[PDB]
Subunit: 295 residues, 4 copies
Amino acid sequence: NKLSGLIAAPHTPFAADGSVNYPVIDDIAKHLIATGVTGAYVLGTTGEGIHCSVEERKKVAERWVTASQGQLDLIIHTGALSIADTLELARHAETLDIKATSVIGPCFFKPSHVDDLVEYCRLAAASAPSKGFYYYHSTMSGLSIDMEKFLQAAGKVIPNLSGMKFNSPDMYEFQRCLRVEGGKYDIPFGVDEFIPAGLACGALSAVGSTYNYAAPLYLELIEKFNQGDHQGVADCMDKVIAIIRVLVEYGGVAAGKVAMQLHGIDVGAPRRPLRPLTAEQKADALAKFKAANFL
Amino acid sequence: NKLSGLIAAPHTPFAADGSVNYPVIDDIAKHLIATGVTGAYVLGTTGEGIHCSVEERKKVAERWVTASQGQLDLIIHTGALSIADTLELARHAETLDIKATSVIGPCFFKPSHVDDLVEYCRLAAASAPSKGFYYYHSTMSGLSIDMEKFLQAAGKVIPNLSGMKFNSPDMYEFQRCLRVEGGKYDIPFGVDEFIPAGLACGALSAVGSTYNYAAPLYLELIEKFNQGDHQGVADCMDKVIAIIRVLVEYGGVAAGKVAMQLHGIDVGAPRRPLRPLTAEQKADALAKFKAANFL
Amino acid sequence: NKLSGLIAAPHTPFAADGSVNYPVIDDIAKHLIATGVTGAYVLGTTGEGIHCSVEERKKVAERWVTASQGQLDLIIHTGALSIADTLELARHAETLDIKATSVIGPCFFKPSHVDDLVEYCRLAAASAPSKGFYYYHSTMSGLSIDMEKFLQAAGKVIPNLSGMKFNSPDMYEFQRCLRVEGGKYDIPFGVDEFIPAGLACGALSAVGSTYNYAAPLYLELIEKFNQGDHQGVADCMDKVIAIIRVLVEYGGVAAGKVAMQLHGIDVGAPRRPLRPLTAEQKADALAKFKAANFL
Amino acid sequence: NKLSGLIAAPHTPFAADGSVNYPVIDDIAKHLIATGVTGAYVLGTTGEGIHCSVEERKKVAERWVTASQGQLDLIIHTGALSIADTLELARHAETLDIKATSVIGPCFFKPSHVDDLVEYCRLAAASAPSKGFYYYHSTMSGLSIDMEKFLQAAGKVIPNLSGMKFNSPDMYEFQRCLRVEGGKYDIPFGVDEFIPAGLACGALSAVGSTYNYAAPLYLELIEKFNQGDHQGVADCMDKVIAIIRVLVEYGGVAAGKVAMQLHGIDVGAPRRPLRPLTAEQKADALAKFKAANFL
């Protein structure tokens, strides 16, 4: 069963001292359900998964299950630089009522051959075997492996392979991945500000940080696209562009976290090494988000 | 005013000894006109302009004017690493019945500030003042200058600025450039294998190498896209993808030059430093182009 | 007290099933002491620190203390993508009889401003305050921050700053770092195959993987350098080059681990995602190490 | 046979309007001879060769022959993006009383295989067959070809191959190149700010821009290095570092051109696309050069 619609990549909320603020996960989940989002990609980049300890990540995933009350497709990102940590997280995720697990490409010792990336993913997927498995392809990992070649090789050895979260501007590679094995795999599209391109290139779902706080804007864009209203799509993209400008100026995680206050949710600052916003910067970011006129 | 439809970036034909084979330009131009292409972007990357001497480039541009008989919008790429060469080529282009001149970003001493790239373009545009002027933005130049900021700054000091040929996968930047100065500028889209993305993001024209030999395929794709026939676009992209695979395997210039034989035109090998294809490779490339089923 | 001489960056030994083989740490330590190495940089890149869990890393550091019996300067790399993990590791290292802790630059969310990298390091250093602190500068982290600027800023806020392990070919930057604050800081040089350059540019110590199994070769090179025997330095570098060729062919961690069998120590395979060597590759690597003629 | 000592890479002097100011070449050459420089690498990066037209480059090379009166080893850089230009420049250089020609790696269509770079060089060397031939390896070209493999392959098909100008921080690669074919080839070292590293790694000569105006400083550094006076080398490098800081702040070509005024020589501004210095910046750069205390 492939994903559909908008899947948020939610933040992990931190208290003033940087500890995980677990009850605020309930707030985020309720907001996602209310705004038409169909799922959550948990503890990925936007969720600062790699900023949390193994024990924090287990507790965050458990809280997402209880908070979502079966109303969201849940995908748990279990990736970490340590295979010990990854497999421990995968074994825990296997005990949860979730749709799938996922790992991003290791970004320090960078796999440079298809087979090496496949074997890393095979281990993670085999530790959560009764759940689906998505590779998380991100340009932030800096890998040079072609994702069509990866998907073809991984499909032969990972029996619970579901597909790939695609965080890359390479729309040619995206289209080739959609065609692997006769279209078998699920390739949720990961670049929010490319959404007209994703739709035109065959995306069935999109996973992204801005759907945490601007999902109705994108649901309107999708409807205008389906209705052939090209001017309406452009008008929606005026507002999408205005959002992205704030993320570029102030940092995607930091500014996106501030944006949650436009829905009454204080998810705290990012964790170091990410830089927090000053009070002046937070007020400027909120003002620019409001001027974007999407709420 | 603005370009429309498909603009081919034609090859420069070389004889067996590597000299320019000027009469074959007549053949290419007749083919472009016959297949519905509306213009030619001359002596760019596909045309190996930087592989030709100043005197060769002057004669090539003259031959395109004569060969096209007023039936193609002609844009002459005048860019070179030497400003002396660039301005000599621009002064010559100013004497020709052409639509516009254009320069690519200098790729050795790479401009790193907006104003530095603007001043280089300003000199080139001012030597062909009565023609339009397109900046050629290519990721091959390796510059880190944002194209929206460039276009805003360039518009203030280049009075014949027409816009920008956009050879980059950054669809967010593309959409911002389309919006500069209330949509004043012309931003032809340069990434053939992204054409559904470009169209969905507002492209009014496309400029590319594959329109030299597969224009009917892309004309059909554009028709299906304008009709909202999403499956039709994907079916066309099956064939586009098959073409691109051959260019990736054998080299874009080298394989595209071979593809011209499918229309009876021998444009020779690329010039060194580009590598020529062996007889066996040429035959394999032609077989793969035929199997792509676009003719 | 600045480091002196050769500091090995030891491997972490794994058993056949990938678990940590703690008693083999005793073997490595005894070999380092016997071959004239003065210290160990523990759980860095060569030690696959980021491949181990927090609990594994604590136990590995404890074993290095007991194994070394006060005969080695010990520097514990505590860096991890999670600040929670890093500070937990630093708090544990503070309880150990070691010289210093160290963190590498975070490589996913890459700090792009000096102050942001400084604050990350300040937190790690302040959790092991009674030990020295070395920043681990590695080109593998992909950061664009100038290390002289970093050291000048970090010196103002990190009171236990000792200096920097310098794993970069930028010998100009290296020389500037040696001069910060009148030469206050310790800059162990991290590129083994550059050692003549490091010596000529003022290095007082070198930290590296090849000193695990080839320390006498480099001790001879250093003596020849000090004695003005330029031909002897070149002759030693013939053998250094032969070693590096094997690391390039088969992987630095994987081939270096195999090299430990030339001293009777089986440190196992690298952990995934690093690729293990086949039996045929291991035999070829050992044969090439022996042909290098350094043992 | 092989170069020795310091080889300056001289500037090309431009008049106020950007035209070549040929008589100032006489001034530069007289200064180089007076200060003990043994050769000139002409129309390379520092000489802005790729900023000059073919006819300008011919006349510049002719002026260097006349101005130097047989007292400098002359190497003419003939490289250009167009093979037509390169071979025309090489044919002209073959008529001159010079030591060698040279080409830099093409930087737009980047050769990615050894044999492709070899064939480009082979053509350029074969058009000036009675002169030596140096490949110019520069990281500015952005090629990923290993220079030892290149030199081994090039030696088999280029009979007048002399060696390689080495502008890269990879001292391991440098040392391997020095060893090719039993040490046959000449590998002048191109990174001024690394000169202690180059000397320690076997350099017999250095080619660089700062030897245009600080040759006595580097002659003293070489003397101290050959004496094994490690503190003396470091004291000289204090002044080298101070020079390099000005080039980093204001641009290597732009600031180095200004530095020629410290010897009474006005070589003008760089050519566009390089940015000129304002009057205030020129005065600040000259003050910083004077404070470096090398004159």
